[PDB]
Design a protein around this ligand. Sequence first.
Ligand SMILES: [Mg+2]
Ligand SMILES: [Mg+2]
Ligand SMILES: [Mg+2]
Ligand SMILES: [Mg+2]
Ligand SMILES: [Mg+2]
Length: 247
Amino acid sequence: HMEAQFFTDTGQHRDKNEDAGGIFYNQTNQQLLVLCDGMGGHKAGEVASKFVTDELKSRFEAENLIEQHQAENWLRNNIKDINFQLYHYAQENAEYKGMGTTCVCALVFEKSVVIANVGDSRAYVINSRQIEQITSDHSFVNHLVLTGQITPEEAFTHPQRNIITKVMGTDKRVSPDLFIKRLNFYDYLLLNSDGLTDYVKDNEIKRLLVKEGTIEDHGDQLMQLALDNHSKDNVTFILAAIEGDKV
Ligand SMILES: [Mg+2]
Ligand SMILES: [Mg+2]
Ligand SMILES: [Mg+2]
Ligand SMILES: [Mg+2]
Ligand SMILES: [Mg+2]
């Protein structure tokens, strides 16, 4: 496990906080990081994001030991099962029909992290010289950037900029992206909703983290930076400190 902290804010000009997440521990005190951005464009986004977060918590706390070689399968299978349960829960309740959420999550190991991603929430690793986005946004504008139809700058001024193309709960099937990242030579792991990075550039995040301070110092400053950039969305992130290999 890492020293890690969860941070969330409703943001300016949002009525409700539909982001969810947490830091959870299994029976041998291994660590799972979870972040979910419930869909504001559909009904009941807070129900969906907290549904997925609660299921991951419950499933992980029931486990004794998930070692690194089991982690990709565990995350893929549980994300698929939770998507199935959420989808049919939404179909069975007319006031929830159409609800959904992103999910990025990470199982932490001594020298690596295993990440699953559905949607446009993100995971990054950061050190003094670079910031690497591990995940790939399942967003319509990312589709437009990759197909060369718009520039990454034009993405921020697109009418359909908030649209996402892979979501938990909207279909009975889902295919999460799985990533394995070695933590050696990195200083921080960051999971975040788009309320942060829609408004704060990667280099701004890296510059903040290279400074002195605790995880809570950095987290509060990063939240203030998102708000100073007038984020119009819920802003949520988990910051986790990677312990350098001691001599
Ligand atoms: Mg949302
Ligand atoms: Mg709503
Ligand atoms: Mg977005
Ligand atoms: Mg270092
Ligand atoms: Mg959002």
